[PDB]
Design a binder for this molecule. Sequence first.
Ligand SMILES: CC[C@H]1CCCCN1C(=O)CSCC#N
Lengths: 300, 237
Amino acid sequence: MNTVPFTSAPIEVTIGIDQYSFNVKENQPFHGIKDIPIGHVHVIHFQHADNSSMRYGYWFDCRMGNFYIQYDPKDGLYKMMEERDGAKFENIVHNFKERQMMVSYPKIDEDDTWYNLTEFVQMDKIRKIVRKDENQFSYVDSSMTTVQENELSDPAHSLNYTVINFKSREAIRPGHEMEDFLDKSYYLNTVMLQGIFKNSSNYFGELQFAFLNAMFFGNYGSSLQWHAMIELICSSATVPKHMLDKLDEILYYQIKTLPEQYSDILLNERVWNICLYSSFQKNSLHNTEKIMENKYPELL
Amino acid sequence: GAMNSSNYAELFNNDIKLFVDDTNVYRVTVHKTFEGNVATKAINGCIFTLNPKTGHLFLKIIHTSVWAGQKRLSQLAKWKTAEEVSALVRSLPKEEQPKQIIVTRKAMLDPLEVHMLDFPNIAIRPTELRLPFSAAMSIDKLSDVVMKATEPQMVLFNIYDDWLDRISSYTAFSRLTLLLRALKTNEESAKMILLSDPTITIKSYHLWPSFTDEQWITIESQMRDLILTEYGRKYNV
Ligand SMILES: CC[C@H]1CCCCN1C(=O)CSCC#N
């Protein structure tokens, strides 16, 4: 079990840790979050009580170092930092535990939700999508745009997701125009899986990270990326059976964790009606189809 | 964006553009099988690719052999059309290639867009105009060359005959669309108007009769009347 502590909470803010969240009042005695499960990436995220503009947060892996948060009154935000001195951190941390000024990462033991949402997400891949190599952790917020969004403006602050474009030379073999546009199997399997991602685990890690950034930060480009990665699989006639099975479980837990009041914006009608009802895989997503119908029959 | 009544004069500016109509590419008669089922039998079709400024018509004849052993032919026809239009463009010299291609049916957009990926600077546009180009097979010489073809074939015409020696492209296109609209709404009556007077002939190298300017005004009026009539006969007005 690991701990992401705070120097203080000088402004009223709603603090999220993974799918959990709690309200902290201005200058309330809050010194951080303990009992954080080792083995997974995590995200700690913020929404100020006074300017709900900009949700922002930090992806991190407690294995990669000791990371704490101090409010910066000049830049106006809670920043993550990486301490390089052990002992002082553990001793102050012991003291913090001792004064019980920390909330406990509140994981029900029955609950596998976070694992299932982050199964293929690795910090190494996050850090290549979010480029800032002097930090072990990665900042993301509501407004950041993706590389592909920028093509159609500040590169240092971009989400460098893998570009998918169904009407592009990368996706369409000369001479197979109709074949490849109606059956994206060659774009999926040869171009993206074998060529760019190397395996389906790295494909799924990016898909999962894109969903999580869309859900937690309202990041529009991430939502587009999530749906594009789904559509590429659902529009391929030839998908390894193990990827189809795993994709069903992936999407099931994403739709399960989405707030019901956010469906209007984060879910793209066209992509889901095609994937579940009109596409090659219309019959291969039973668990995802079941929850979408019992929870979002409106969209369909 | 899309082409409509508002940006209508853009057709006659000096940017090269082509209309592409695919409504006569896949043509079938629907008949009964000995077992009382229904079957289609294809006949030769054509792609109608037209420069509205110059009248130049690239009539790509689609021979029924292209469909042999193929499935979902109506969908195939759109991709075949886009393949052939892309091949036409690649065959033209650079200075003759169009800057825009306007498809008459919106289902041609993605097929053509995908075939033209090598041409990022050629805009593929739809249109809100309901153009009567389907009636091109009511022009006798065009219909004759399609039905007689024994192999795939490209045949070049000027769909305006020599009209541009005396009238502008705008007026020529308006004349063409009126003629085609009449042939579409009542082919028989339209052909009666065009070929009634035994003294007016079609030159061997033309598609339409050799009307004087005054005769063209009379013809055009008669075509308007036919269209309005059928609009009455159809709607009971
Ligand atoms: C995160 C709790 C500790 C240990 C990590 C470095 C900074 N820390 C502070 O509390 C900042 S004010 C106390 C001092 N120095």
